[PDB]
Amino acid sequence: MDWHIAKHYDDILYYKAGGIAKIVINRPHKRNAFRPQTVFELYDAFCNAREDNRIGVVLLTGAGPHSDGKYAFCSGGDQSVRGEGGYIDDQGTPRLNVLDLQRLIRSMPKVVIALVAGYAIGGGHVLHLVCDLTIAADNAIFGQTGPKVGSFDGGFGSSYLARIVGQKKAREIWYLCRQYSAQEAERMGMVNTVVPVDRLEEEGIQWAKEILSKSPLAIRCLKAAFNADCDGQAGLQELAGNATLLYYMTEEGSEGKQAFLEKRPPDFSQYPWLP
Template sequence: MSGFEHVLLERADGIGTITLNRPDKLNAFAARMPREVAEAVQELAEASDVRVIVVSGAGRAFCAGADIEYMERLVEANDVEAARALIDAGGEIVTTIRNTPKPVIASVNGPAAGGGANLALACDIRLASDRATIGQTFNRIGLHPDWGGTYFLPRLVGPSRALELIYTAEMVDAAEALRLGLFNRVVPHDRLAAETSALAATLAAKPPIALALAKRAVYESGDRTLPEMLDRELEHQLRCFASDDVREGLQAFLGKRPPVFRGR
């Protein structure tokens, strides 16, 4: 366990879990908390014993974005450097999530607003409680989306729907977020932890090389041509073909036993 004030960090069975831990403030970001999250994400991204990363929130919220009282103090003091540090930390967090070869799951247990929404959108997969809500609430207090919202949101829902969500700043309920593609799956609130653990365990048992290369290819495909992606698939497939994991997968299939992939 790392010594963070507002972040809980756990590792077990190949799964690293980051829990935003400021439940009395709906896990809203203030002061050093974004930096702690950035350090926690980086730690798990580099950890050799972690194959899957899970991000969730303590209490009844995932993350309410920036702490309003903290933001008011920054505005009153005209503390541009502290505001820049908050935004820069968010950029570092979402960039690390996107660049790590490991699958990253957001377990959205409640409201995800502003930067908290975009933290969830940065993750590869979003499992949500039926009590969860999500929204680009920035302009309610006169602000512009940050933490990658203008990048992730239109890629998920298209530019027109993204602008509608940004313009209205409405919180979308779980059913609508699922329909829009903001959430991958919605489950009963009391099943979220178990469903998240089951998915994380499933992914942790998968071949790490194949998953890492697939993540890279899918995210690269947005600005590539079909011929370029076919070349990338050939490159990645041959890398997998040469791995010990392929031999293990084939032998396990033929031997009618579960494979044990070691990422080699």
């Protein structure tokens, strides 16, 4: 693929090619753990993808292999900056801003695919989970660590995981903090497919292209519909929001607008009350 750099960052790499964006967490010396700046940059990059009318799919992955030969998607919050009440940014502010990133990935009307090679651990595991889809390399390793390292994600990390692998397996994952292979992760329902490491990016590109040939309006409505099964009124906001969008493409709707601007009463008399 001919990837073009789209913007420069300190902790990540960001590329575009056709309708695909690629976001790479680039802190291999920390197994691609995120510090607050990493989350800020990830958020910025995902926002850019959201605003780009040409991009329909974002591939999210980690830099590797590292000098020690190991692969990693993301090892979660950088523990070396963890202080009282959160992860300390350069101004001394404790933060949990990955929560904001989680929501953006979840709600943006573009499909996000996690491409996992090596470790997807802790907060890194939850990031893989909230991505729409996950493609794993056969060397991928999945797991949570919260109860061992003094943390937990009781939001999407728990409930949404249960909506993927079911309640028994979700609890096992969090309580024991074991590691799971790519094959185990696929069998339990949380990984869509598994390929060799050297095929991981091309598979992502293949899946991305099958989506890029579909109707953008259809895709965004379906993504909202899936969220609507989880996120109550916030889910309804996204789903109803797309209904409003589509309604704003109708003549019936436009008559309401035109009537207001022309200071006359609207005339919906020709329009039927359908069953």
